[model samples]
Target: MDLGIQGKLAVVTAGSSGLGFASALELARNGARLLLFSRNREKLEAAASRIASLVSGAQVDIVAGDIREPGDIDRLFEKARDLGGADILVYSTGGPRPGRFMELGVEDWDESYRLLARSAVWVGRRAAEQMVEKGWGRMVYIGSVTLLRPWQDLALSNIMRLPVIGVVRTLALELAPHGVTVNAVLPSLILTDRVRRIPMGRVGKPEELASVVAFLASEKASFITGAVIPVDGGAHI
Candidate 1:
């Protein structure tokens, strides 16, 4: 399929491992130059190398920084501009610590906002600005199925991810006129290193989620915006 991603530039946060890495890999496979961000320098380097090996001659750049830091988000946008404006932006981050509503502290709520909701807002704002200027762009937020069907022991995610839905929905409506599409991909239990146990017959793979991201990033998905597409294997059912 011609995703219309050739020669385009993409940025994937938390791309050092797991689902983010898989998203970057899929973008690279479709011939998009990639800028992957993570806090661990070692893991960032290893991931960049692995992607390069898999996609020969693929341009994979890595930025080491924590997404929760506003300064880091600024630096990420600056770097993306330096590499040439990004045509696609994939917002992926680790979930915050889990706890019950009453058991969760104020600090836990603040931290969850910083990691999941606020970080995405900052990145999405910057990406939207660039996209508006170019009159073309794709922004996909890696969300969780918990947003649709809340899960126990994940009160933090359940609460915070709701804000992202509002963010993406508003942005999609505002940016669609500029040729930029904003959407979220909600994934079920993906078989990444993080999942120690696979309760279901099998867990969804990163590439599976990546494929949805790639489609949403492509010109073929021009009409898709303000959508919360679930990539889970009937996990929400």
Candidate 2:
């Protein structure tokens, strides 16, 4: 399956493990060059090597930084510019603390906003700049299905994630004229350490979620934008 992303450079955040890692691997398999971002340098280094080993002739680069820091994203993009600018962006971030409305403190709310909402703008805007310049780009955001079906213990996520959707829609409308697409994937009940103890018999794999992300980032999905796709196993219902 030639995703038509061959030779395209994809910058994936949280790209060291789980869904982000799987997305990078799948993209590499389809012949895309990779710039994987994560907080841990060791994990980022390991992930890059693993992808290179699995996919023959894969080109993987690693950046270690937290999305909470604005400087880090600047550094990431600087590296991207060195590699010939960004052609695709897979924006995935770590989840915030779990708590009900009352249980969550002001600090929790602030950090959640930084992790989910602010970081989205920081990364999305930078990626969009390069894409708009090139007149071709793809941005796939990994959102939680909790946006569709609110979870009792995920108040922070539910509230903060909405802004991410807002960013996606706004970018989609604005960037459409420039030949850029912006969309999101809402994943639920995935068998990652972050999401266990599912009530359903069937759970999703990281690879399963990654495939949708890869498609949205591919040239084949040119006509799709501003879409909030649920990769949940009917969990939103």
Candidate 3:
């Protein structure tokens, strides 16, 4: 299947490792120009090397930036145009601090919002502008399965991340006319170092979640928007 994705450009947040790297790698393999970001300069260099290792001179760049910083978001867009103006934005971030409801402080909650919610919106709007101008774009956010079934220890995730559904739904309608699509992937216990719990009896490989994310961002999924597709191995079932 020709996803028809060659030569496209993508800006992937938190892409220096884990699920973000997986998704970005797949896109690069399909001949996309990828600008991947992470807070760690070493990880970004390693990830850039890894992707180039696989795609054989893949068009890829890496930047060190925290997704929570608004200034970093602007810097990302600046780096993005260098890759041909950001045709895709794979928005992924590190998981927030783990705690029960009462065990957490207001500061913890605020940080979680900045990490998961605010940055998602901020980057979405920034990417949307470029997409709208070019008449095409694809955005896939990495949300958690907790969005459907809350987790006991993931208080911040349960609270701050669910709003992403509303964000996707709204963006889907608002951007559809301009040939932009907005959707999310809800993963349950994927086999990243960050995930350890799974009802599926084992954690999922990063590529497992990555393939679904790539499909969602491909031309094959243009009609799909405002949808939360789960690659949970039926854990929700």
Candidate 4:
């Protein structure tokens, strides 16, 4: 299936490993130039090398930085602009610390908000601005199923990821007129380092989530804004 988004550039946050890396790989497979961001330099370089080797003539760059810092976000876009504006923005971040409501402290709440929610807002806004200028772009946020149904011991994620739904929805409505699609994918118990206790016999592979992201980031998904499509292998059911 031709996704109609070859040769375009994309930026995936927290993309050095796990689902984010998988998403980046899929984007590259579909012929998108990639600028991946993460805080670990070693992992970033390794990921970039692996992708470059896997995809012939693939243009993959890495920015080692933390998304929780606003300055990092600025620098990331600057890097993207240097390579040329991004056509897709895949917003994925590390899972927040898991704990019961009473077990979480004020600092935990603040940190989770900064990592999970605030960062998405900042990245999405910047991507939207660039997309609006080009009059075409795709923004796909990686959300968890916890956003729709709460998960035990994940109070921080359950509480924090809710805002992303609103953020994507509002952005979708506002940005669609400018030809940019804003949407999210909710994965249920994906087989990443994050899922340790799934009784489903097996966790999902990163490529499974990646396929969905690649689709949403394509011009074929032009009408798919504000949707939260689930990629879980019926784990939530």
**Best TM-score among the predictions, by candidate number:** 2
Q: What would the TM-scores of all predictions be? A: 0.94, 0.95, 0.94, 0.94
- Cα lDDT tens digits, model 2, 39-77, are 999999999999988999999998999999889998999
- For 1-237, candidate 4 gives per-residue lDDT tens digits of 999888999999988988889999999999999999999989999999999999999999988999999889988998888887978999988888878888889999999888888898889888887889899999998888887677678888889867778889999999978999998887764442143244456667788789999999987888888998877766656
Best-performing candidate as measured by lDDT: 2
Q: Judged by TM-score relative to the true structure, which candidate is superior, 2 or 3?
A: 2
Q: Residue 79: error of model 3 in Å? A: 1.3
Q: lDDT score, residue 55, model 4?
A: 94
Residue-level lDDT of model 1, residues 1-237, one tens digit each, is 999899888999999987788999999999999988999989999999999999999998888898989888788878888888878999888877767678889898998899888898888888887778789999998887778766577788888867878888999999988899999988764331122133355668778889999989998999999998877776666
Lowest-scoring 10 consecutive residues by lDDT in candidate 1?
190-199
lDDT of 3 by residue, 120-198 (tens): 8888888998999899999998888878877778788888977667778888999999999999987764431132244
lDDT of 4: 0.86
RMSD of each: 2.3, 2.0, 1.9, 2.0
Candidate 1 Cα RMSD after full superposition onto the native fold (Å): 2.3
